[PDB]
């Protein structure tokens, strides 16, 4: 996250941190995710596409830091990894960039509720907040586009939803942005998501609930003028989510 503030997981208790195991001993961070129900985490398909071996991923809930432990964290193995059939990548964009991970702990259980582990709410069919709404994003992604390391502490920032008319202007992203995506930016192009933030949440209050409105997907650069961050429009995937989380 470029800008933002450092926070703790109690301020984002639905955030899930996904890592990959390597032969040699290290485990590396892959993407962010969100807890929708006790056994299901939602993230982005491009985070797994090039290495779809579920057995090598670890999911942690209740983590405020990247490589150190947090008291209260829960560790899980990925029982089911559901990618989106029709996921597509082109220059810049990712289409249908949403994925589901069914988690199981070594004792065979799903997440348990605590002050550091909570689910986030799903929007209702095709329902979104109006543009201008401020939403927050969180993650362990880069703090500057030129960095080659991720922060150790979790960060968050506030961004505003912009309209598709504004995002599809030729000098922004043109038609690369579709109706199944959402755009969000800072009025002064100061804070934004960046590499390492993929898969995590875009949360806005909708009908009184803090709702999962988007999934961090792509953006040209990070915090660049006229280059908003693009998110998967969760309200348009509710039938798909339902299809596997039933």
């Amino acid at each position: 996250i470029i800008g933002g503030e450092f926070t703790t997981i109690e301020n984002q208790p639905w955030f899930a941190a996904i890592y990959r195991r390597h032969r040699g001993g290290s485990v590396t961070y892959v993407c962010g995710g969100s807890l929708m129900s006790p056994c299901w985490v939602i993230s982005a398909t491009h985070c797994f596409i090039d290495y779809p071996k579920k057995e090598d991923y670890i999911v942690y809930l209740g983590r405020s830091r990247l490589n150190s432990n947090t008291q209260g964290e829960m560790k899980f193995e990925v029982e089911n990894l559901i990618l989106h059939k029709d996921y597509s990548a082109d220059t810049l964009a990712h289409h249908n960039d949403i994925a589901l991970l069914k988690i199981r702990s070594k004792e065979g259980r799903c997440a348990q509720p605590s002050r550091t582990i909570q689910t986030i709410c799903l929007p209702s069919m095709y329902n979104d907040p109006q543009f201008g709404t401020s939403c927050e994003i969180t993650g362990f992604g880069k703090e500057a586009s030129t960095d080659y390391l991720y922060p150790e502490q979790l960060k968050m920032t506030v961004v505003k939803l912009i309209s598709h008319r504004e995002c599809q202007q030729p000098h922004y992203y043109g038609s690369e942005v579709t109706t199944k995506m959402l755009c969000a930016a800072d009025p002064q192009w100061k804070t934004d998501a960046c590499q390492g933030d993929s898969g995590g949440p875009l949360v806005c209050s909708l009908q009184g609930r803090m709702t999962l409105t988007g999934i961090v997907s792509w953006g040209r650069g990070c915090a660049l003028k006229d280059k908003p961050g693009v998110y998967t429009r969760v309200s348009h995937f509710l039938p798909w989510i339902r299809s596997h989380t039933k």
Partner: peptide
């Protein structure tokens, strides 16, 4: 206690 989506405590 039990999950209540979107509520932070």
């Amino acid at each position: 206690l039990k999950f209540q989506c979107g509520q932070k405590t």
